[PDB]
């Protein structure tokens, strides 16, 4: 069986929805059983995120009806351009019903001045709940029968932890397999699940790709297709190297090491379940359906495969004599960053144990600076002597499964970096010699990636 | 003001105590103000540890009586060999006799009750230095200079009550010692020990004597701290591994810090810190080779790579995670789990995928770590750590040097060399201060690597 | 003068107008605090829960229409078209606020302690303006406020808010310099950020007192449907006469948990600054009434019906074994109120009394604290259901030899066996426990002998 | 089988030890199986307490040598008085010396290290009983019966690890003593102490020598437990207060416990519990009047049995705003006094619950005041703290008081007539005890009055 995910851009308008359905229908004639996972229409989640704060703060009753008319029109148009007056009618009722529902809650949070995380998750869920019926209708508007379902209905049962729910148990087989055994293409809302007692929950960032992975995992599928707006994964950002090419084949392991925080396509949560059961992931371009795309797979003669970059980040060094194991000073650093919700991109601590270096995003520096002040306070008194911060810095990451055991490669990567005129500020390579991460000045980003790419990829 | 510290081997016998007395006297002629810091005679601190546990466990007074006879002899012979003057010789003997009597009662005490609390554990170890110092002080008086012996607490080291590894609370070194110096007196301070508000003796821990010298120096604003040992300064690497290893003439505070790995021989970060803060140079000298120029640890001039440190037989732990990102404080909980369980972590690296953390610990701590980790998480549908892996029989090399900062090419040159040596790099950690590069290779390739590395970057 | 009016005192529009003339009569010599109408606060509670559980669209609509015509007819028979106008809308607005808040909880399905308190306040905000109205109608100037506007600053603790600051004179004085009577909706207070809080049961009295405290007022009047504090419950003894003068400390000792007229919290502020409290009947304003202020032996006899007597027996229960601490610890959680405590010189057992609907609650609590001589440190607990508390009260008893002897002999002669005795160090109150069968004969005898 | 307990005064000298041995011997003609629980000789436990304290503080070696000289001279004197036989005298002296040497060691130890752990504190205390035990065992031997001295733990009393006042964990009493009793051997067990699971000596606390007898009796299903003291049973009321005070011939388990205020001489609640549980009778007898009939605590049972008194005590009133049951206000009062270990003699709370009234020993007032404020108008919630220090507790005990209408009235009128004002009353559900407090000066005329009207 084939599970097929599409995101917000791919279902950006009625036209694109109709095009998605065409893609779906085409695959259905090659594969009997097809489950489609669908995101909210582009820029709907965000519209939803802000009215939620709009209702809580400014609290205007009309500003809500103003938002309602907007979603109404946005999706009314999609129905007109995706779909047959017959199907147009049934879908229009589903849409009206969800919109009535949506209005109420917003009116409620306005009236009370209260937006609990439970309420917050209910709002966001409407995005995908208004997308899926329109797609389902379009599938139906061609050859195949199709129904739309919520993540709960689909068998994704979660925590009570709203906004970022953990999945307890998958009941994917029980709900979908009967519907598949009957010919139906179920179109499942991505990004959302339910709790035992019926409450609607969201799955955080990368959620739709995650739902695709869970469904794929539960049904023990033959393949999971992540349909996006680029032709798979490139060897490096084409905005930096114009001659970059699609990677035909990636190992889960390699895909994992490329799936950094804030990456557009790859995420560890989507990859891990597919890796566990050995299910292939295929990244495809809905705007270029014929492209071979990137296959993330189990089997695997290259050394370096890809070069990922994280631009505009900051470098934080924590100085402190002692800082030696007899004191859980590291434990306290990360707690102070744990609270305050500061994401640590790289950690590096050398032999002396007198300092640890970290890279965070440049909007988190001051956030994490006051955090470390609150935990420690700044010889005869405390244990952090000094903190250092380097702004406008960047993380380059060289990835390839063939790097493991390959004597000499680090030497080559770094000699190259130097040959391009870049000074290495920090290096971090973990025990699975599959990823070498390092830090250089932003000025040198462009010339350094050009060289590495020229030397190691092409 | 010159602080001069002497360890166990430099004061390991009477002859030796007299030798370090002449060194102290010789510097007293160039520099008017000298404070000395001395450890117990070699083997003594160890001997005191064994008798403690023995008195607790077997509980035999005859063995205590025996131990006292060993201690008395050793120190009597020392006096008889350090000091020519009979009148001085009797003053020191007097002091020693007090301490033996006091030490005996504690030991008989612990045998009788079968209770060895940390407090008593510290009071006992204390006797090591409280028996050396008066002899060194005697040998100095014997040579013509005014001198008396003091305990660390008596000299201004006021500490926490955390016996065994006490933290320093107040530094009152200027209050006690300066009046002594002004009279022309060489105070000799028992290194490694402090005191508490109520006057309970405490110990400072591993490298305590060195720490005492640093505290005196910091407290006084000494012109120089001199650490006298049995080797001629800091070497470019372990001479056992490279026979043609040379003494580093000059070293920076950061370099020294970066060379002072946990469990190191001469350098410790506790010691280097106070000196760094007030900009007091540190000089490491050889007591048995007092002509060597040794290693000056000062402010900062050319050199890329200065030294290579090594850490034999450690272990590499990789923790593969479910997400392990900035929304789930997994890193916080890892280091907390190993904090409790008292597990010291030598290296850390986390790559940009944020999906794994690699750390190296000591190979006796592996089992402690795995148990500790399994306690905090307990190993798709179950927990937040996917799996943990371990590599035994590995080692850490660190290349250290201030000139490496901004030295485009050096990291490339180092790792290519390592590779040329016939070695695969298992993990890299280099920090924002481009002064140290640490990596991990198999124990198999330690010797070959350090040889090649030293030949190409030092000599 | 701070006159307080309650639920049944403002029961209908007539009642409100009757109340309105009373205040007008007071003003001739020289601040009025008001509660809500009868069974209105009890209704808001049920509609709150209604709108949380069933959250029914039709079942809410009928509620506001109820309190529409409840208050619409209250305007009819309480109030000239000068003043009838500025209540209709002045209450329609407050209703559509309540309706929106109510439909607010109906849509979201979440009732915070904050939302509850905001809902509960409406009761008083629906009653107050109407009274303010009939004060104007009778030719006297009047304004209707709100606890917070009057300066009752409270905790963040919704339902039972601890008072933190008082802006007494600072908000009320200028209105008094104008001839306006401030008609203040009591029971409710505020946060520093304007969020309405409630004070708990016996709150409208507290509010009245708090006004008195900060102003250092001349008098505090509590207007109810009984002619003051009686010598005993008149429903049991028909010969029960009213108490004219009651000591501060005496009124406190006559106030048990769940009592009607008196309240220790409300008594407290008045006892501090030394402000008299008068209680008078609204159905008979001519009556003398009880005056709580700063002779004779026994003053009054209070009674608590339908209680239970737990007895905790354990060998040990001494000093180092702090199970006394744990009995109450278990009873503190599970929200169990203890009426009486006794422990003899042996320290082996402790006797308590609680409402006889708390036993199973209190037992389970005790069992989840001790494993119930080689096991736990408590041997056994025993209970006596259908039992009652009688308390004799008088400051004249303090240092008066004989009264206790005589009291218990009087009890004896009524045919009653005493199960438990507790007398505090102040000697103002004597409290003992007897079978329920005996309560009627016992109180009558006691009152027959020591009051009349 | 019979267990027989003797206290410090009853073995206050060697002659008295022989006298006890004579008592134990006489009893062994009647009952074939007797076990004896013995305390330390009079004044020895006290001597041990202040010396082990002394060794901690002054750390004076010479003052230890005096204590041993003292203890040795006391017990050698005792041995020579109690025993006639030279060979027994010889073997008892050898025991006593080995024990005293052990004592010296530990006392030296505490002085040398300046440390007195609760564990060591217990080991030292255990010596008093370990020194008197073998003298008495020897004394029985000299009179013709087979006997061994045993430590409480060797007898099967296994306890906590909470030194100084341990709780019992298991009884191996039957396993240890039954093979001895089947051979005419009189085990004399050191009262007051027991062992830890890993063989560490622990003490049982105040009244712990009586409790030993009880634990033995429980563990052996004894037929009779005998507490031998220096008074002919338990009196109706303190003899020092009423001259013509008679011995109470019989007492119930429940009456016995109401008479046992924390500090009482003979009766202790913890001692009564086991005997109550298995229905084993307790007989209290007079070692200096062996012909008395004493007081029997028992099952099988006109109105008021006894008047109990607690002298020179104090009472505290806790006035507060609201102080309702809704909040955990009462809990915190007792937690506060739980820490700093303050014993509450009486508690009282009226229907107002605005105040609570407790009684504590007068030498705890400040020790209770400070700790209360350290736990805690509009600022706090506890308003006042009144206090007296010129008071006592009187408690009238009788089983036949329950359901006896009018007795409380009769009692408080009697108090009233004697010339005393009642400051507080407390009566429990089990109407076996009415406790109350009056001015100290009134105790004499009050107790005398109560005794007149309600005893004979
Ligand atoms: C994110 C991806 O799945 C989607 N097609 C998009 O680009 O919006
Ligand atoms: C600093 C060192 O790691 C690197 N070779 C550089 O200078 O760029
Ligand atoms: C450690 C050093 O200072 C000492 N002299 C030694 O050789 O032991
Ligand atoms: C660095 C590491 O990835 C590789 N095995 C090397 O030694 O070059
Ligand atoms: C509370 C009281 O004042 C009111 N009149 C009532 O009886 O309801
Ligand atoms: C005196 C005494 O009998 C009574 N209880 C009193 O009021 O003090
Ligand atoms: C037990 C007896 O010897 C002791 N004198 C007492 O009366 O308590």
The verdict on D20 and D62 lying in the same domain is: yes
What DSSP element (H or E) covers B132?
helix B118-142
d(CA A187, CA C421): 75
Nearest Cα to Cα of residue B405 among B432, B430, B434, B431:
B434
The verdict on B241 and B307 lying in the same domain is: no
Q: Position of tokens 């005493």?
A: C418
Whether residue D88 contacts residue D131, with contact meaning beta carbons closer than 8 Å, is answered with no
Task: Give long-range contacts, CB 8 A cutoff, 24+ apart: D29-33.
Answer: D31/D1, D31/D2, D31/D223, D32/D184, D33/D1, D33/D2, D33/D181
SS3 of chain D: CEEEEECCCCCCCHHHHHHHHHHHHHHHHHCCCEEEEECCCCCHHHHHHHHHHHHHHCCCHHHHHHHHHHHHHHHHHHHHHHCCCHHHHHHHHHHHHHHHHHHHHHHHHHHHHCCCCHHHHHHHHHHHHHHHHHHHHHHHHHCCCCEEEECCCCCCEEECCCCCCCCEEEECHHHHHHHHHCCCCEEEEECCEEEECCCCEEECCCCHHHHHHHHHHHHHCCCEEEEEECCCCCECCCCCCCCCCCECCEEEHHHHHHCCCCCCCCCCHHHHHHHHHHCCCEEEEECCCCCCCCEEEECCCCCCCEEEEEEEEEEEEEEECCCCCCCCHHHHHHHHHHCCCCCCCEEEECCCCCEEEEEEEHHHHHHHHHHHHCCCCCCCCEEEEEEEEEEEEEEEECHHHCCCCCHHHHHHHHHHHHCCCEEEEEECCCCCEEEEEEEHHHHHHHHHHHHHHHCC
Q: Could you give the strand order of the β-sheet that contains A34-38, starting from the edge strand earlier in sequence?
A: A146-149, A185-189, A34-38, A2-6, A223-228, A281-285, A294-297, A249-251
φ and ψ of D415, to 5 deg: -55, -50
**In terms of DSSP bridges, do strands D186-190 and D34-38 run parallel, antiparallel, or are they unpaired?**
parallel
Cα end-to-end distance, chain D, whole Å: 36
d(CA A369, CA A387): 9
d(CA C319, CA D262): 9
Nearest Cα to Cα of residue B67 among B127, B107, B116, B40:
B107
Q: Position of tokens 């005792």?
A: D78
Residues in chain D, overall count: 456
**Chain B contact present for D60, CB below 8 A:** no
Decide: residue B357, CB within 10 A, 0-12 exposed, 13-18 middle, 19+ buried: buried
d(CA B446, CA B309): 11
d(CA C425, CA C431): 12
φ and ψ of C16, to 5 deg: -60, -40
Q: What is the DSSP-derived secondary structure letter of residue B393?
A: E
The verdict on C189 and C85 lying in the same domain is: yes
d(CA A270, CA A247): 18
Output the six-digit token pair for B162: 């955390």
d(CA B155, CA B151): 6
Nearest-CB residue to D106 (from B112, B117, B119)? B112
Strand stretches in C155-297, DSSP E? 163-166, 181-185, 188-190, 196-198, 220-224, 245-247, 277-281, 290-293
The verdict on D100 and D142 lying in the same domain is: yes
The verdict on A141 and A120 lying in the same domain is: yes
φ and ψ of C307, to 5 deg: -115, 170
- Choosing from C279, C294, C309, the residue where a domain stops is C294
Q: Do A105 and C104 count as a contact with CB atoms less than 8 A apart?
A: no
Q: Which ligand is nearest to the CA of B36?
A: 3
Q: Which atom of ligand 6 has the smallest separation from the CA of D420?
A: 1
Whether residue A138 contacts residue A19, with contact meaning beta carbons closer than 8 Å, is answered with no
**Chain C contact present for A60, CB below 8 A:** no
d(CA B51, CA B422): 49
Residue B408 in contact with ligand 2 by CB distance below 6 A: yes
> Three-state SS for B171?
strand
Output the six-digit token pair for A342: 């500061």
d(CA D60, CA D52): 11
For CA atoms D402, D406, D412, D415, the dihedral sign is negative
d(CA D349, CA C113): 33
Q: Which ligand is nearest to the CA of B439?
A: 4
Whether residue D45 contacts residue D122, with contact meaning beta carbons closer than 8 Å, is answered with no
Distances (CA, A) of A125 to A122, A134, A203, A207, B133: 5, 15, 10, 12, 77
The verdict on B291 and B387 lying in the same domain is: no
Which residues 414-443 of D have a C-beta within 8 angstroms of C? 414-416, 419-431, 433-435
Half-sphere exposure of D388 (CA within 13 A, CB side): 21
Distances (CA, A) of C444 to C407, C413, C450: 13, 12, 10
d(CA D228, CA D231): 9
Distance B285 CA to ligand 3 centre (A): 10
The answer for residues whose C-beta is within 8 angstroms of residue D57's C-beta and 6 or more apart is none
Breaks in chain B (C–N > 2.5 Å) following residue = 300, 379
Half-sphere exposure of A448 (CA within 13 A, CB side): 27
Q: Position of tokens 């939302």?
A: C115
Residue C107 φ/ψ region, left for φ over 0, alpha for ψ in the -120 to 50 degree band, beta for the rest: alpha
Q: Do B112 and D105 count as a contact with CB atoms less than 8 A apart?
A: yes
- Which residues in D2-30 are b (16+ Cβ under 10 Å) and which e? bbbbbbbbbbbbbebbbbbbebbbebbee
The verdict on C380 and C411 lying in the same domain is: yes
CB atoms within 10 A of CB C45: 14
Which residues 97-126 of C have a C-beta within 8 angstroms of A? 100-101, 103-108, 110, 112, 115
**Chain D contact present for C396, CB below 8 A:** no
- Which residue from C minimizes the CA distance to D336? C325
Q: What is the dihedral of CA B32, B37, B42, B46, to 10 degrees?
A: 170
Nearest Cα to Cα of residue A337 among B280, D328, C381, B333:
B333
Decide: residue A85, CB within 10 A, 0-12 exposed, 13-18 middle, 19+ buried: exposed
The answer for residues whose C-beta is within 8 angstroms of residue A436's C-beta and 6 or more apart is A397, A398, A403, A409, A410, A413, A427, A429, B351, B428
Distances (CA, A) of D433 to B300, C217, D256: 88, 49, 11
d(CA A32, CA A27): 9
Radius of gyration of chain C (CA): 25
Distances (CA, A) of A216 to A1, A170, A223, C162, D115: 9, 11, 7, 56, 69
Q: What is the dihedral of CA D410, D412, D413, D414, to 10 degrees?
A: 90
The answer for residues whose C-beta is within 8 angstroms of residue B382's C-beta and 6 or more apart is none
Residue B9 in contact with ligand 3 by CB distance below 6 A: yes
d(CA C443, CA A362): 80
Whether residue D272 contacts residue D257, with contact meaning beta carbons closer than 8 Å, is answered with yes
D contacts of C253 (beta carbons < 8 Å) = 350, 352, 354
d(CA A270, CA A233): 15
d(CA A22, CA A186): 15
- Do C and B make contact via 3 or more CB pairs under 8 A? The reply is no
- Structural domain count of chain D: 2
The verdict on A310 and A271 lying in the same domain is: no
- Which residues in A350-384 are b (16+ Cβ under 10 Å) and which e? bbbbbbbbbbbbbebbeebeebbeebbeebeeeeb
Whether residue B394 contacts residue B441, with contact meaning beta carbons closer than 8 Å, is answered with yes
Helix pair angle (B61-82, B118-142), 10° resolution: 20
Half-sphere exposure of D222 (CA within 13 A, CB side): 28
- Choosing from A249, A271, A300, the residue where a domain stops is A300
d(CA A106, CA A54): 9
CATH code of residue C388:
3.30.2130.10
Decide: residue A196, CB within 10 A, 0-12 exposed, 13-18 middle, 19+ buried: exposed
Range list of H helices, B315-402: 330-339, 366-376
Q: What is the DSSP-derived secondary structure letter of residue B295?
A: E
Whether residue A176 contacts residue A219, with contact meaning beta carbons closer than 8 Å, is answered with yes
The verdict on D296 and D308 lying in the same domain is: no
Whether residue D149 contacts residue D133, with contact meaning beta carbons closer than 8 Å, is answered with yes
D contacts of C322 (beta carbons < 8 Å) = 334-335, 337-338
Range list of H helices, C30-112: 41-53, 57-76, 81-108
- Choosing from A300, A328, A353, the residue where a domain stops is A300
Output the six-digit token pair for D15: 């002659």
Which residues 358-387 of C have a C-beta within 8 angstroms of D? 373-374, 379, 382, 384
Q: What is the DSSP-derived secondary structure letter of residue B39?
A: P
Residue C280 belongs to domain spanning: 1-294
**Best residue among A398, A407, A431 to mutate for probing ligand 4, ranked by most atoms within 8 Å of CB:** A407
Nearest Cα to Cα of residue B271 among B290, B256, B251:
B256
Q: What is the resolution of this structure in A?
A: 2.7
d(CA D97, CA D139): 17
d(CA D456, CA D402): 19
Distance A430 CA to ligand 2 centre (A): 18
Q: Which chains, if any, share at least 3 CB pairs under 8 A with chain C? A: A, D
Q: Do B108 and D108 count as a contact with CB atoms less than 8 A apart?
A: yes
Nearest Cα to Cα of residue C233 among C224, C244, C243, C223:
C243
Nearest Cα to Cα of residue A267 among A330, A187, A190, A342:
A190
Nearest Cα to Cα of residue D32 among D65, D1, D54, D63:
D1
The answer for residues whose C-beta is within 8 angstroms of residue A58's C-beta and 6 or more apart is none
Ligand 7 atom 6, closest CA: D229
d(CA B261, CA B139): 36
The verdict on A210 and A71 lying in the same domain is: yes
The verdict on C270 and C377 lying in the same domain is: no
Q: What is the DSSP-derived secondary structure letter of residue C283?
A: S
The verdict on A286 and A338 lying in the same domain is: no
SS3 of A187-221: EEECCEEECCCCCEEECCCCHHHHHHHHHHHHCCC
> Three-state SS for B442?
strand
CB atoms within 10 A of CB C23: 23
Nearest Cα to Cα of residue D7 among D39, D44, D46:
D39
Whether residue C308 contacts residue C356, with contact meaning beta carbons closer than 8 Å, is answered with yes
d(CA A432, CA D342): 64
CATH code of residue B290:
3.40.1160.10
């Amino acid at each position: 069986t084939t599970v097929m995910k599409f995101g917000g851009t791919s279902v950006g308008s009625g036209e694109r929805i109709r095009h998605v359905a065409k893609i779906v229908t085409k695959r259905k004639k090659e594969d009997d059983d097809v489950v489609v996972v669908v995101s909210a229409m582009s820029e709907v989640t965000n519209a939803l995120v802000e009215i939620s704060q709009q209702a809580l703060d400014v609290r205007d009753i009309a500003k809500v009806g103003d938002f309602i008319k907007f979603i109404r029109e946005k999706h009314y148009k999609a129905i007109e351009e995706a779909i047959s007056e017959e199907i147009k009618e049934e879908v229009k009722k589903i849409i009206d019903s969800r919109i009535e529902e949506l209005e109420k809650v917003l009116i409620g949070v306005a009236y009370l001045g209260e937006l609990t995380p439970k309420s917050r998750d209910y709002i966001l869920s409407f995005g995908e709940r208004l997308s899926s019926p329109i797609l389902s209708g379009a599938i139906r508007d061609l050859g195949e029968k199709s129904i739309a379902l919520e993540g709960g209905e689909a068998g994704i049962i979660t925590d009570n932890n709203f906004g970022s729910a953990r999945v307890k148990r998958l009941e994917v087989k029980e709900r979908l397999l009967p519907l598949l055994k009957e010919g139906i293409i179920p179109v499942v809302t991505g990004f959302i699940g339910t709790t035992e007692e019926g409450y609607i929950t969201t799955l955080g960032r990368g959620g739709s790709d995650y739902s695709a992975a869970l469904i794929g995992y539960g049904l023990d599928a033959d393949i999971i297709e992540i349909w996006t707006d680029v032709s798979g994964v490139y060897t490096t950002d084409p905005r930096l190297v114009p001659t970059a090419r699609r990677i035909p084949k990636l190992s889960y392991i390699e895909a994992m090491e490329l799936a950094y925080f804030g990456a557009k396509v790859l995420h560890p949560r989507t990859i891990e379940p597919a890796m566990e059961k050995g299910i292939p992931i295929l990244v495809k371009n809905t705007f270029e359906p014929e492209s071979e795309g990137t296959l993330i797979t189990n089997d695997m003669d290259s050394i370096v495969k890809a070069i990922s970059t994280i631009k505009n980040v900051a470098l934080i060094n924590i100085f402190g004599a002692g800082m030696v194991g007899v004191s859980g000073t590291a434990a306290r650093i990360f707690k102070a960053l744990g609270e305050e919700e500061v994401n640590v991109i790289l950690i590096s601590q050398g032999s002396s144990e007198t300092n640890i270096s970290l890279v965070v995003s440049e909007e988190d520096v001051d956030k994490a600076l006051k955090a470390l002040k609150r935990e420690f306070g700044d010889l005869n008194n405390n244990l952090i002597r000094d903190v250092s911060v380097d702004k406008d810095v960047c993380v380059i990451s060289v990835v390839g499964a063939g790097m493991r055991g390959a004597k000499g490669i680090a030497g080559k990567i770094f000699t190259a970096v130097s040959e391009s005129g870049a000074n290495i500020k920090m290096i971090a390579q973990g025990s699975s010699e599959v990823n070498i991460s390092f830090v250089i000045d932003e000025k040198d980003l462009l010339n350094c990636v050009r060289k590495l790419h020229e030397k190691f990829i092409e």
